[PDB]
Curated annotation (Swiss-Prot):
Phylogenetic placement of the source organism: Eukaryota, Metazoa, Chordata, Craniata, Vertebrata
CDD domains in alphabetical order: LYZ_C
Residue pairs linked by disulfide bridges in the UniProt entry: C6-C127, C30-C115, C64-C80, C76-C94
Cited PROSITE patterns: GLYCOSYL_HYDROL_F22_1 (PS00128), GLYCOSYL_HYDROL_F22_2 (PS51348)
Protein's name in the database: Lysozyme C
Keyword annotations from UniProtKB, A to Z: Allergen, Antimicrobial, Bacteriolytic enzyme, Disulfide bond, Glycosidase, Hydrolase, Secreted, Signal
Gene: LYZ
Length: 129
């Protein structure tokens, strides 16, 4: 599913992402835009053989099981395919463990390089929240 911007903001707020670990909702919408373009079905292979899944491009190196990332962990205890569903519950709950891992939203390279320090509030401008 390809989310609309305010549709995704609404869904992320519902699942408790707004100001989770201090990151306002616009941070999460911006990261989703540059990670997946709001597409829950996005996948992308990393150079080490791991794969990023879903609207927040969660990495099978650490966080989910896809059966084909040999040295890896499954810290969210979830099959990576669950991160591709039209329902974002699994992605959000897993992203809460990632952002709590000590590095904040720097865990997402796209957030650091394209959202951090910008006017991330613009990403939720006009949304009924
Ligand atoms: Cl949802």
């Amino acid at each position: 599913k390809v989310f609309g911007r305010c549709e995704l903001a609404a869904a992320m707020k519902r699942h408790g992402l707004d100001n989770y670990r201090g990151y306002s909702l616009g941070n999460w919408v911006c990261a989703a835009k540059f990670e997946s373009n709001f597409n829950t079905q996005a996948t992308n292979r990393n150079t080490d053989g791991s794969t990023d899944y879903g609207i927040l491009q969660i990495n099978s190196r650490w966080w989910c099981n896809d059966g084909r990332t040999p040295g890896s962990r499954n810290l969210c205890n979830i099959p990576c395919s669950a991160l591709l569903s039209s329902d974002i519950t699994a992605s959000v709950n897993c992203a809460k463990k990632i952002v709590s891992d000590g590095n904040g939203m720097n865990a997402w390279v796209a957030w650091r390089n394209r959202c951090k320090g910008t006017d991330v509030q613009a990403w939720i401008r006009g949304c009924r929240l």
